[PDB]
Design a protein around this ligand. Structure first.
Ligand SMILES: Cc1cncnc1N
Ligand SMILES: [Cl-]
Length: 153
């Protein structure tokens, strides 16, 4: 179909699912592939090759469920995999109060041009990684403008 419609639907799906999980302190880790490949990391997860929806993203990350423990990787117009491994950053600049999801999101951002979104299960804050930088606890307006700029081409 039309690319721009899928991209805006992707953005709305992330905004809606992360708002839902943030409110309930459900951790999440969602990495959006771009030009650089996430293919090897997709292979580490459970293959879904599913249509993107906020409902599916929420169901994946329910705690103590088969699909929740690891990253979701979106590729093109599909949720490609759940429970994928991402490389963990060894950076000592990452705050010690952040968890493995953040360290994983930082690590993939150091070696891909992917955009990765984290929901902390400790605080509910939403964070974002790109190019080896972390944007910690962004507002809904900040998240919206970042995703517009980064995911709509
Ligand atoms: C430990 C871990 C958790 N989630 C994603 N990647 C990882 N390496
Ligand atoms: Cl967390």
């Amino acid at each position: 179909s039309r690319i721009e419609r899928e991209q805006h639907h992707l953005i709305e799906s992330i905004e809606k699912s992360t708002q839902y999980m943030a409110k309930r302190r459900i951790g999440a880790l969602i990495s959006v592939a771009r030009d650089t490949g996430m293919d090897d990391y997709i292979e580490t997860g459970i293959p879904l090759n599913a249509k993107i929806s906020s409902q599916l993203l929420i169901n994946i990350f329910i705690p103590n469920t088969p699909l929740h423990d690891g990253a979701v990787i979106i590729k093109g117009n599909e949720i490609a995999s759940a429970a994928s491994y991402l490389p963990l950053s060894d950076s000592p600049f990452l705050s010690k109060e952040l968890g493995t999801r953040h360290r994983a999101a930082l690590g993939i951002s150091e070696v891909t041009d992917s955009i990765t979104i984290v929901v902390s299960e400790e605080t509910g804050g939403i964070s974002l990684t790109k190019g080896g930088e972390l944007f910690r606890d962004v507002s809904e307006e900040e998240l919206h403008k970042i995703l517009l700029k980064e995911l709509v081409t």
